[PDB]
Amino acid sequence: SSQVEHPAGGYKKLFETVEELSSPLTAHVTGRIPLWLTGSLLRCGPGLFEVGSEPFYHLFDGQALLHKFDFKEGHVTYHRRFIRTDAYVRAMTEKRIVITEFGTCAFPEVTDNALVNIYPVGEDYYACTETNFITKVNPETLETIKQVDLCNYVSVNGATAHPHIENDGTVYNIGNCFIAYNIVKIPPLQADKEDPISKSEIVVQFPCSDRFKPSYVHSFGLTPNYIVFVETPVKINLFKFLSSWSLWGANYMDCFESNETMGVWLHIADKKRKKYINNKYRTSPFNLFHHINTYEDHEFLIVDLCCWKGFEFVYNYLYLANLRENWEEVKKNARKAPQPEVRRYVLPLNIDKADTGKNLVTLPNTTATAILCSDETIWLEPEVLFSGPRQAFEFPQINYQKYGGKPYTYAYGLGLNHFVPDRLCKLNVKTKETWVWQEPDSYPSEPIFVSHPDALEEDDGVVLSVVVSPGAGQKPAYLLILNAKDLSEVARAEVEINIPVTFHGLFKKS
Amino acid sequence: SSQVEHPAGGYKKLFETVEELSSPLTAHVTGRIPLWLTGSLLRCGPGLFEVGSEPFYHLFDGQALLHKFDFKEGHVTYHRRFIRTDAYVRAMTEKRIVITEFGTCAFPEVTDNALVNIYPVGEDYYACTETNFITKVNPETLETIKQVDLCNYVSVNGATAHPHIENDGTVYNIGNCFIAYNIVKIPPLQADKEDPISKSEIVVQFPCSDRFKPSYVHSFGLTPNYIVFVETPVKINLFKFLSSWSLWGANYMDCFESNETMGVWLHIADKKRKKYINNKYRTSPFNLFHHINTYEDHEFLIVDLCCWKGFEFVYNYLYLANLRENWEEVKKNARKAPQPEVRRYVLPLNIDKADTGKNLVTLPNTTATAILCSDETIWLEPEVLFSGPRQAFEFPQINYQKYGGKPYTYAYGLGLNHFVPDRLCKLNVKTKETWVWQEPDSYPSEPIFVSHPDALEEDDGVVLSVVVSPGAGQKPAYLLILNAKDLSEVARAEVEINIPVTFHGLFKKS
Ligand SMILES: NCC[C@@H](O)c1cccc(OCC2CCCCC2)c1
Ligand SMILES: NCC[C@@H](O)c1cccc(OCC2CCCCC2)c1
Ligand SMILES: CCCCCCCCCCCCCCCC(=O)O
Ligand SMILES: CCCCCCCCCCCCCCCC(=O)O
Ligand SMILES: [Fe+2]
Ligand SMILES: [Fe+2]
């Protein structure tokens, strides 16, 4: 949990327009930047929160800004450029809001505002949002290369900002199809050197709980042998979605509703046999954005999730007007929102009818349960790993390359305090011990883990976070490097300009 | 959690017949019994697990044995006597099992085998089970005085072994009525000196979820202004219950079944206005035996519970044959049982329709939620206070006289390890810190708190537990005194004879 209030309102700087740079700045280092840290931290976020006098309304509406911190020989640079999307380019051309964003209807066509994340496919990097358009970008210059329409290649209406990436470069993602949820597989770059997106395929399909209302989907789980998909009660109303949007004046946010009675349905597919498995896993209602990690342990799937307890769409609390309120009002507004909680669910793969009415979760080191009912639904209860009053352990990251999809012990996260990011966290998922890093009037980003090259242990490395530190006596922002063992500070690299909120990203080793 | 295995099987001594004493034994003290500790620890349990060659089958079948440790001027005695119930007396007379017990059908009429608890009404003390018969006993000699049939006074078929006792001596309890659950109020002893049981009344009534199947009920919650009842999916099948029992050969255990679809329904009544309040609180399935404590905080009820996650009846795992198995087999048997978990539920008293779809739990220091649905059910999620793999924090006790029904911080409990009692626990319900007391091959009882008589703080006192320590190198049993602050040992009082399992009891100040 956080141990801090924010009466000064410095968090408002997360949602304030900035300018791009024409070339990299030097970042003033204090402490010691590890000499083995060589490469680029690449992150996305909104950077332009109004076009002239026309305002963007929602957290996810501001125009995509691609950020880069470079690390070489203990020295750091910072650079940023707006992504030249249709949304941005046409807004600059016409000097108004042209494309409808998530929560901002444009007055008189799908957004490609790639403000959320960035990931590799073959030798390329793509910025994304959650729509059918991803944007190829140059990871060294931050130039925008190409718009790619996933619909030209596979049958999906969108795809998440959280694809899983296997060690050979294979990319998996999930997307709505208008009804199913399709898993897309993009193969690694092959000898022929042609673009791996042109070899995309749907490998497996998950069914939908309601023919006319698909669930919103933000991420999914992957193990060597299984794919896990969590169907939440946040639904997309397709009657509102597929009508004339500039008639009645709609945006994406206007098309969501909550199903009060379904709870959550969890789904598994066989990854290698490409086959949906018909186990009716059921539990109580929550929103889910980020899976932490998933793994196989005997005949069981361990599914670790950042949950929000309730069926109301958490995105309702993320209009900019609310996030720009003063501290007492920010807290008041979040009182009735769903409560964040890290939960471990355990999914049995061997369902014996003879165990009807009992708990199937026979593993020795969890309190998670799974009850086989007579209708063959399997009712799940979680083991809670972390729970704090409006204190979210969010934007989770692990040592992904070596532990993604596998037995693991540690996760790192961004700590939200009534939705305001004010700390960095580490959770031991076996023991539930936590570690916190926190300074007054400091607003960090998702922490990203980078392994030490001679690491023996899961947490032998650092985490990198971009921190916004407003109010003079300090420089506006900095790159924070923390030791992954105990979250003690190793270094920081201060810059002379503001940085707004960023959502996701990656470290690119060079 | 426990840190101990039990390969020696010493826990079997908890379920072995003992002989009563004709007068008190001296208990050899080591360490220093507090000089302000003056009075008697009174506890009930089974003491006779077979009649001749006819065996009792279930944990709750053995014949009631009343235990007493006396404390005066740093010296301790121990005494025990079988309760002269109809079950016991007739078994001694006829030299066989005459009355059907909970899980033991008698070959050829309700049991009054008062093996569970003991409590005060006016100037009297009554041993109880959960039936319509309670047994008046003498707290100084341990003589049995008389049988009382609650049906002669109030309309109930039974009553729990966990009445609440207000500071003036008022007694509240709950019982099934064959359909409702009735709250019985027994007033304090008045000037006229007549037995307060003759002034018993039903003050309020809780409705039943199923006309033909009432829920099993073990305890309930009480605050200055409210009564809380938790209706679980463990049901009593009245078609099986009310048929001729010695025809098809039935016992009490044979009449229980689990409703797979209702989950848990929570109920509140206005204590002072004597009125059921019609709020449809709903959550997922669990068994519940013991409420820890209940209290009012602004317009909310805080409801702390020892839960078992699942709908299967936990009492199915408590046949003596299973509890007498070897350790590896005990653990194996408990793998599919419900998982124990301490949970805090929070019940809003102000339901505004304008908040439909949202979390009503606006308190600042909980993660518990309560969601108002369109059908007006209020779906609850808990804040988990303690969770360990088959490690139950059970038989909870608090500083009851000063904190029962009120804001509080500390609970004490008996720690079960795959149902085997092997430690004593303390839980801070605000911070979730725990403290443990544990020795190898030692099997404690429910801890009971005694305040230092001039204490101003909540945990300024001691806990008392009766501990079975088999295997030579030690005396068979002892009374354990721990400091309530940190569970560090203060003293023990060893006795030369075995003591079997005991369930509940009290400290009687003299
Ligand atoms: N990560 C926050 C949401 C944001 O990425 C976003 C911004 C703009 C549109 C949008 O749409 C999501 C839908 C796309 C089509 C298929 C259904 C989901 C989603
Ligand atoms: N504490 C463990 C259960 C035990 O007290 C017990 C032993 C024997 C009979 C019995 O009956 C409970 C029913 C009484 C009538 C009303 C329904 C519950 C209960
Ligand atoms: C760094 C963000 C701070 C302000 C917003 C915090 C509220 C986050 C709520 C949970 C996560 C929602 C998903 C956002 C990340 C994404 O777009 O992938
Ligand atoms: C000291 C008891 C040890 C053996 C039984 C442990 C299993 C207890 C399960 C939860 C509590 C059930 C109620 C027992 C006490 C009572 O009858 O009131
Ligand atoms: Fe995300
Ligand atoms: Fe009990």
From Swiss-Prot, chains A, B:
Bilayer topology annotation: Lipid-anchor
Domain of life: Eukaryota
Chain positions found as Phosphothreonine: T100, T104
Binding-site list for Fe cation: H162, H218, H290, H504
GO biological process: detection of light stimulus involved in visual perception; retina homeostasis; retinal metabolic process; zeaxanthin biosynthetic process
Lipid-modified sites (S-palmitoyl cysteine): C208, C306, C307
Reactions that this protein is recorded to catalyse: an all-trans-retinyl ester + H2O = 11-cis-retinol + a fatty acid + H(+); lutein = (3R,3'S)-zeaxanthin; all-trans-retinyl hexadecanoate + H2O = 11-cis-retinol + hexadecanoate + H(+)
Cofactors required: Fe(2+)
UniProt keyword annotations, A-Z: Acetylation, Cell membrane, Cytoplasm, Endoplasmic reticulum, Hydrolase, Iron, Isomerase, Lipid metabolism, Lipoprotein, Membrane, Metal-binding, Microsome, Palmitate, Phosphoprotein, Sensory transduction, Vision
Main location: cytoplasm
Enzyme Commission code(s) on record: 3.1.1.64, 5.3.3.22
Modified residues (N-acetylserine): S1
Record carries keyword Acetylation: yes
Any one GO cellular component localisation term in the record: endoplasmic reticulum membrane
Subcellular location(s) per record: Cytoplasm; Cell membrane; Microsome membrane
Biological role stated in the UniProt entry: Critical isomerohydrolase in the retinoid cycle involved in regeneration of 11-cis-retinal, the chromophore of rod and cone opsins. Catalyzes the cleavage and isomerization of all-trans-retinyl fatty acid esters to 11-cis-retinol which is further oxidized by 11-cis retinol dehydrogenase to 11-cis-retinal for use as visual chromophore. Essential for the production of 11-cis retinal for both rod and cone photoreceptors. Also capable of catalyzing the isomerization of lutein to meso-zeaxanthin an eye-specific carotenoid.
Family indicated by similarity: Belongs to the carotenoid oxygenase family.
Self-association state and partner proteins as the record states: Interacts with MYO7A; this mediates light-dependent intracellular transport of RPE65.
Protein name: Retinoid isomerohydrolase
Originating organism: Bos taurus (Bovine)
Gene that this polypeptide is encoded by: RPE65
